[PDB]
Design a protein around this ligand. Structure first.
Ligand SMILES: O=P(O)(O)OC[C@H]1O[C@H](OP(=O)(O)OP(=O)(O)O)[C@H](O)[C@@H]1O
Ligand SMILES: O=c1cc[nH]c(=O)[nH]1
Ligand SMILES: O=c1cc[nH]c(=O)[nH]1
Ligand SMILES: O=c1cc[nH]c(=O)[nH]1
Ligand SMILES: O=c1cc[nH]c(=O)[nH]1
Ligand SMILES: [Mg+2]
Lengths: 219, 219, 223, 224
């Protein structure tokens, strides 16, 4: 069944974070995996889900302690997040969740990477000039083979960024996809909403959702 | 000691669902609590904590099995929510949560109850004509003596709303505040983000966050 | 027809700012006026005009010239807006405009005023209110969707004045309005400003604005 | 003067739609023009401007008289909009306005076009593109905030024509632009409409609108 798959990657991969499979999440998923739903509903529930994913993501960033006084003039053991960060989206598929990040991390810096296969290739790219100094949120909705994401982490490591400081924010991923990215580059963080059975004769996830970018942008 | 409080309420008030005490959660609460944070920042974060509130609360709603097929012609076992809802906000304080509810529940019906101290007393109220046949998301940021939330429930109950069908959405709650609601109306459901240590002479929650109402608005 | 009505008040009350009757505007209206359009669909087009209306209301404030330097290293002869302000809504009707105002004006102060006609006397009566402590120093955006008899709106303007706010510093942000309602407010307190999206022609036996939309409060919040 | 330039490109280019210079508009422009303001303030005011921009461009669409009945049980003589539409954002700079378009036109389809000057030749060239397969039978809201020399926007219109898009069902949505940038699009493609919010005086050696605002994208994504 489904449980078996989940449990295995959890036990076999410490740096991967699975969101709590709350009913309201299953629900959102069915609504987007279903091929019937209109384009209007797909982006809404997508967004509605993206956001819930980014929050469970910003939970991997380092935080320090910080005391504060309440209006009632009494202290509180609050916490705080320093660390400069930025968002990096894999062209089109990733741009999906950019808006979801700027909703919670105002005026956050956005970087773009166009990984095109004709071995995956690099095409266009604009990143923060100080990307090496910050923590990176790697945005890619679907993780099928992990070839473009593994090409993304590759261009990033060559530019400086520390592997231990990458946080792959994803929605759907295949077991073969998550174990390759973790074989190629351990020490990275992965946060997803769901992991499926396997790959298609082609390279699509099963059950899957289809082609995210196409369904998200209307093409 | 703030660890022991959550323990008593957890095992003696089974209907209370406390959000997961995460680093990011504490971080938001840290800033909303701080009396140093200005207008602009107070709401932005408050709006973000609320958003994760309305979500978590939505898992209290009943759902059924639903199947659909992905664009790969393989079926998927998901779920869906029926039984329509509505949102009742205790005027001014809970109105701050309306925008969050309608951000996950497009066009959901909204009700308003304005309870005033004379003994809390009803002053004005406009609920959906339907109401008595729906699930009710009761909005109220602060719950110190629970005096107002109780008056808000004895008024909904007088309108034919099923006790077990009332989900109380709260941000900050005081121990004595809980014991009151679950004593007068033991079948309601409560979802809070933070449970505090105690109230003071002016019946404010401490540490607390002050008067959520005018802090969210213009003092 | 409509153009003989819009022109008359334009001439008779130079203090009201009618919005530009565009195709997109006219289109929105008919969508929300249609007794058919479903709830979720009525609020979408609602909050979409609420925003276009507020953006038109912000040009009623005072501004000062402001020169800036651009990345090309040159100067720009710009302007800028000072003048503290705040929003004040008429409970359950204007509230539908808060969040809109809060969208172009991050964390703007919002005050509430619940007015109520009497069950017998049909008399505008104050029920509740919470305005900013210094509401007299700031400029005010009075929010209220409908304006038929203008009964409540004049009472709301009344409590504000008797609190230090300057009449000529009150700006009336409204969606719909009938000739009588805007003849009365401008007869009562002549210096306020009013920005409306549209002015119908008359009211019916129930004092409702006829081409109208019905009950903006119930239609927006559902209920 | 200024009223001189603007008056000219208004009378010799009937298809340009110069947003009404409201104070609040002058206000915003100022803030997004200050090399002094922070990232977050720039996006906030840019977005707010964009949304206003898009709401003006939608009126370049065709409507049709329609009646409806008011809850007061009486008719209203309104208008309605059909003619399906999509949005085509030139990669990066144009993307900024995307969310703005989806804020008013829910679920709308979006096609991207990544044009880029050549290594040595220095002329525009197509590199990547993903548009709606149906794009030939719909109106196109082309998204590009800047209109310098118009080399990129023209190379955009070109690919849309090669796909069967009518050059009159093309609404060019832009914020700030240069007179020679306008001159260029209205030479190659005279039937495309262009609604903009600002028209400066000239362009410099780097090909930047002189008063201008610098590198829009660079500043919008914070990659400078
Ligand atoms: O009409 P033109 O003469 O081409 O001038 C304006 C175009 O060029 C700029 O792109 P820029 O290279 O500054 O790159 P980026 O914004 O995508 O980073 C601008 O964003 C428009 O796309
Ligand atoms: O969008 C995509 C890309 C690859 N595989 C999928 O299932 N979806
Ligand atoms: O502490 C409290 C109690 C009630 N309402 C508030 O805003 N704060
Ligand atoms: O038509 C009318 C008149 C007053 N108030 C409303 O909500 N509608
Ligand atoms: O005006 C200009 C010139 C170059 N690049 C931009 O983004 N804008
Ligand atoms: Mg660009």
């Amino acid at each position: 069944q489904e449980e078996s798959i989940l449990q295995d990657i959890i036990t076999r991969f410490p740096n991967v974070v699975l969101m709590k499979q709350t009913a309201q999440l299953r629900a959102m998923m069915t609504i987007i995996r279903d091929k019937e739903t209109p384009k209007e509903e797909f982006v809404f529930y997508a967004d509605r889900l993206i956001r819930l994913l980014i929050e469970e993501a910003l939970n991997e960033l380092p935080f320090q302690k910080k005391e504060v006084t309440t209006p009632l003039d009494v202290s509180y053991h609050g916490v705080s997040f320093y660390s400069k960060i930025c968002g990096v989206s894999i062209v089109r598929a990733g741009e999906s969740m950019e808006s979801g990040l700027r909703a919670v991390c105002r005026g956050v810096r956005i970087g773009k990477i166009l990984i095109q296969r004709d071995e995956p290739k690099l095409i266009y790219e604009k990143l923060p000039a100080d990307i090496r100094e910050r923590w990176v949120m790697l945005l890619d909705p679907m993780c099928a083979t992990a070839g473009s994401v593994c090409k993304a982490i590759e261009v990033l490591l060559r530019l400086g960024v520390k592997e231990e400081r990458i946080i792959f924010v994803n929605i759907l991923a295949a077991p073969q996809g998550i174990e390759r990215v973790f074989k190629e580059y351990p020490k990275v963080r992965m946060v997803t909403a769901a992991v499926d059975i396997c790959l298609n004769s082609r390279y699509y996830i099963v059950p899957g959702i289809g082609d995210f970018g196409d369904r998200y942008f209307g093409t």
